[PDB]
PDB file of C-alpha atoms in Angstrom:
ATOM      1  CA  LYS A 248      15.500  97.700  91.718  1.00 58.26           C
ATOM      2  CA  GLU A 249      18.974  98.274  90.272  1.00 58.60           C
ATOM      3  CA  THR A 250      20.887  94.888  90.446  1.00 63.38           C
ATOM      4  CA  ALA A 251      24.143  94.622  92.422  1.00 61.05           C
ATOM      5  CA  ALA A 252      26.015  93.839  89.195  1.00 58.07           C
ATOM      6  CA  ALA A 253      24.495  96.919  87.499  1.00 56.85           C
ATOM      7  CA  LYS A 254      25.344  99.109  90.533  1.00 60.98           C
ATOM      8  CA  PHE A 255      29.005  98.022  90.265  1.00 61.38           C
ATOM      9  CA  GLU A 256      29.015  98.914  86.551  1.00 57.11           C
ATOM     10  CA  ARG A 257      27.469 102.352  87.273  1.00 56.05           C
ATOM     11  CA  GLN A 258      29.824 103.155  90.155  1.00 57.07           C
ATOM     12  CA  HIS A 259      33.068 101.633  88.882  1.00 53.53           C
ATOM     13  CA  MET A 260      33.168 100.882  85.132  1.00 51.49           C
ATOM     14  CA  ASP A 261      34.330 103.437  82.538  1.00 48.71           C
ATOM     15  CA  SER A 262      35.638 101.554  79.547  1.00 46.81           C
ATOM     16  CA  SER A 263      34.946 104.533  77.035  1.00 49.34           C
ATOM     17  CA  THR A 264      38.249 106.334  78.104  1.00 46.47           C
ATOM     18  CA  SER A 265      41.725 104.607  78.364  1.00 47.71           C
ATOM     19  CA  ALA A 266      42.775 106.892  81.353  1.00 50.64           C
ATOM     20  CA  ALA A 267      41.646 109.543  83.847  1.00 52.41           C
ATOM     21  CA  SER A 268      40.590 111.751  81.047  1.00 53.25           C
ATOM     22  CA  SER A 269      40.945 115.352  82.179  1.00 52.47           C
ATOM     23  CA  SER A 270      41.287 117.318  85.419  1.00 52.82           C
ATOM     24  CA  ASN A 271      37.464 117.754  85.056  1.00 55.40           C
ATOM     25  CA  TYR A 272      36.801 113.938  84.837  1.00 55.72           C
ATOM     26  CA  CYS A 273      35.973 113.087  88.479  1.00 56.28           C
ATOM     27  CA  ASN A 274      33.891 116.226  88.928  1.00 57.74           C
ATOM     28  CA  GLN A 275      31.784 115.212  85.838  1.00 58.99           C
ATOM     29  CA  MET A 276      31.718 111.438  86.464  1.00 60.82           C
ATOM     30  CA  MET A 277      30.977 111.468  90.193  1.00 61.64           C
ATOM     31  CA  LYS A 278      27.920 113.627  89.272  1.00 60.64           C
ATOM     32  CA  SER A 279      26.810 111.756  86.145  1.00 60.43           C
ATOM     33  CA  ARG A 280      27.016 108.306  87.748  1.00 57.70           C
ATOM     34  CA  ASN A 281      24.779 109.599  90.589  1.00 57.27           C
ATOM     35  CA  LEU A 282      27.493 109.339  93.303  1.00 56.12           C
ATOM     36  CA  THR A 283      26.792 112.987  94.464  1.00 56.48           C
ATOM     37  CA  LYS A 284      22.955 112.731  94.704  1.00 57.55           C
ATOM     38  CA  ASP A 285      22.472 112.249  98.506  1.00 57.85           C
ATOM     39  CA  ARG A 286      26.004 113.345  99.657  1.00 58.36           C
ATOM     40  CA  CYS A 287      29.492 113.745  98.118  1.00 56.19           C
ATOM     41  CA  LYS A 288      30.728 110.127  98.019  1.00 57.78           C
ATOM     42  CA  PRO A 289      34.247 110.700  99.490  1.00 56.39           C
ATOM     43  CA  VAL A 290      36.326 108.293  97.346  1.00 54.59           C
ATOM     44  CA  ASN A 291      35.524 106.233  94.270  1.00 55.56           C
ATOM     45  CA  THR A 292      37.485 104.332  91.607  1.00 56.21           C
ATOM     46  CA  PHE A 293      36.640 103.951  87.908  1.00 53.06           C
ATOM     47  CA  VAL A 294      38.188 101.130  85.837  1.00 51.85           C
ATOM     48  CA  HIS A 295      39.195 101.702  82.227  1.00 53.23           C
ATOM     49  CA  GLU A 296      39.173  98.162  80.963  1.00 55.76           C
ATOM     50  CA  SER A 297      36.524  96.102  79.151  1.00 60.72           C
ATOM     51  CA  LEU A 298      33.612  94.748  81.146  1.00 59.63           C
ATOM     52  CA  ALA A 299      34.749  91.167  80.240  1.00 61.65           C
ATOM     53  CA  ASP A 300      38.273  91.842  81.579  1.00 61.49           C
ATOM     54  CA  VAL A 301      36.894  93.183  84.938  1.00 60.19           C
ATOM     55  CA  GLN A 302      34.358  90.342  85.200  1.00 59.07           C
ATOM     56  CA  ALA A 303      37.194  87.849  84.654  1.00 59.05           C
ATOM     57  CA  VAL A 304      38.849  89.048  87.904  1.00 57.72           C
ATOM     58  CA  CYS A 305      36.263  86.954  89.793  1.00 55.69           C
ATOM     59  CA  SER A 306      38.251  83.889  88.588  1.00 54.37           C
ATOM     60  CA  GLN A 307      41.689  85.347  89.467  1.00 55.34           C
ATOM     61  CA  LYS A 308      43.652  85.609  92.747  1.00 55.89           C
ATOM     62  CA  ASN A 309      41.436  85.038  95.780  1.00 56.82           C
ATOM     63  CA  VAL A 310      42.350  87.452  98.611  1.00 54.93           C
ATOM     64  CA  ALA A 311      40.736  88.502 101.888  1.00 54.76           C
ATOM     65  CA  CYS A 312      38.341  91.456 101.600  1.00 55.58           C
ATOM     66  CA  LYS A 313      38.881  94.434 103.880  1.00 57.03           C
ATOM     67  CA  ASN A 314      35.662  93.501 105.715  1.00 57.54           C
ATOM     68  CA  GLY A 315      37.040  90.010 106.466  1.00 57.47           C
ATOM     69  CA  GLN A 316      34.869  88.166 103.945  1.00 56.66           C
ATOM     70  CA  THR A 317      36.647  85.737 101.617  1.00 54.39           C
ATOM     71  CA  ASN A 318      34.990  86.617  98.276  1.00 57.26           C
ATOM     72  CA  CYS A 319      37.566  89.169  96.984  1.00 58.96           C
ATOM     73  CA  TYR A 320      39.786  88.734  93.969  1.00 60.37           C
ATOM     74  CA  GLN A 321      42.911  90.577  92.783  1.00 57.20           C
ATOM     75  CA  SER A 322      43.653  90.990  89.096  1.00 60.54           C
ATOM     76  CA  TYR A 323      46.816  89.249  87.878  1.00 62.02           C
ATOM     77  CA  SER A 324      47.468  92.062  85.406  1.00 62.26           C
ATOM     78  CA  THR A 325      47.517  95.784  86.190  1.00 61.30           C
ATOM     79  CA  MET A 326      44.559  97.823  84.948  1.00 59.51           C
ATOM     80  CA  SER A 327      44.088 101.454  84.020  1.00 58.99           C
ATOM     81  CA  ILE A 328      42.045 103.191  86.764  1.00 61.03           C
ATOM     82  CA  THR A 329      41.070 106.658  87.930  1.00 60.86           C
ATOM     83  CA  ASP A 330      40.763 107.403  91.664  1.00 58.33           C
ATOM     84  CA  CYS A 331      38.433 110.272  92.619  1.00 58.94           C
ATOM     85  CA  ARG A 332      39.013 111.957  95.967  1.00 56.37           C
ATOM     86  CA  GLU A 333      36.799 114.738  97.433  1.00 55.29           C
ATOM     87  CA  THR A 334      38.797 118.017  97.838  1.00 60.56           C
ATOM     88  CA  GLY A 335      39.110 119.726 101.269  1.00 58.93           C
ATOM     89  CA  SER A 336      36.848 122.658 100.038  1.00 57.11           C
ATOM     90  CA  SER A 337      34.117 120.379  98.504  1.00 56.24           C
ATOM     91  CA  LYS A 338      30.647 121.189  99.933  1.00 55.52           C
ATOM     92  CA  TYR A 339      27.520 119.330  98.888  1.00 50.15           C
ATOM     93  CA  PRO A 340      25.760 119.717  96.600  1.00 49.30           C
ATOM     94  CA  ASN A 341      28.793 121.264  94.679  1.00 49.08           C
ATOM     95  CA  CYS A 342      30.945 118.154  95.156  1.00 49.45           C
ATOM     96  CA  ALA A 343      34.529 118.636  93.972  1.00 52.31           C
ATOM     97  CA  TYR A 344      37.156 115.977  93.345  1.00 55.46           C
ATOM     98  CA  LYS A 345      40.732 115.515  92.424  1.00 55.47           C
ATOM     99  CA  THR A 346      41.296 113.210  89.352  1.00 59.03           C
ATOM    100  CA  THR A 347      44.390 110.856  89.589  1.00 58.87           C
ATOM    101  CA  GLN A 348      45.142 108.124  87.090  1.00 59.87           C
ATOM    102  CA  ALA A 349      47.054 104.936  87.927  1.00 61.50           C
ATOM    103  CA  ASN A 350      47.862 101.501  86.625  1.00 62.56           C
ATOM    104  CA  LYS A 351      47.250  99.083  89.498  1.00 61.95           C
ATOM    105  CA  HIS A 352      45.967  95.613  90.315  1.00 63.70           C
ATOM    106  CA  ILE A 353      42.288  95.882  91.309  1.00 64.39           C
ATOM    107  CA  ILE A 354      40.564  93.942  94.098  1.00 62.86           C
ATOM    108  CA  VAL A 355      36.824  93.308  93.678  1.00 62.14           C
ATOM    109  CA  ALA A 356      34.243  91.368  95.679  1.00 62.28           C
ATOM    110  CA  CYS A 357      32.171  88.909  93.592  1.00 65.03           C
ATOM    111  CA  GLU A 358      28.770  87.297  94.210  1.00 67.57           C
ATOM    112  CA  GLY A 359      25.904  85.560  92.492  1.00 68.85           C
ATOM    113  CA  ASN A 360      25.267  83.196  89.608  1.00 68.31           C
ATOM    114  CA  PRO A 361      26.748  84.301  87.313  1.00 68.64           C
ATOM    115  CA  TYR A 362      29.641  85.148  89.663  1.00 69.15           C
ATOM    116  CA  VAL A 363      30.330  88.828  88.915  1.00 69.29           C
ATOM    117  CA  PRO A 364      31.822  91.905  90.569  1.00 69.56           C
ATOM    118  CA  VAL A 365      29.540  93.639  93.074  1.00 70.94           C
ATOM    119  CA  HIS A 366      32.056  95.776  95.065  1.00 71.86           C
ATOM    120  CA  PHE A 367      35.353  97.590  94.475  1.00 74.57           C
ATOM    121  CA  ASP A 368      37.547  96.811  97.490  1.00 74.63           C
ATOM    122  CA  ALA A 369      40.991  98.308  96.752  1.00 77.43           C
ATOM    123  CA  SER A 370      43.766  98.828  94.258  1.00 79.01           C
ATOM    124  CA  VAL A 371      47.343  97.666  94.933  1.00 78.80           C
TER     125      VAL A 371
END
């Protein structure tokens, strides 16, 4: 089965670009990372930082997760991210997104040994 750590990398890591490439980026990436296979996933964030820098967030500021669990962590530094947001006119299987870049602190949930990101909770 795909591991939880690998699923986070597939859904949320894009270190090959420094920023929300193009207006096409979320349309291409939501499809290529398999987030439009079963339905249009409504919102998703990609992080444009190294894998090591995202993994290191699991040792940074401990914050409450939106679900009330305690295993979330906020990055001390801002990170380059792209938020993808399904358009009003998007109909599966032709899932359409708006691409918006930001520089924000990320909040991730971490689990396991090694203790690594398994969930993207929020950006602030």
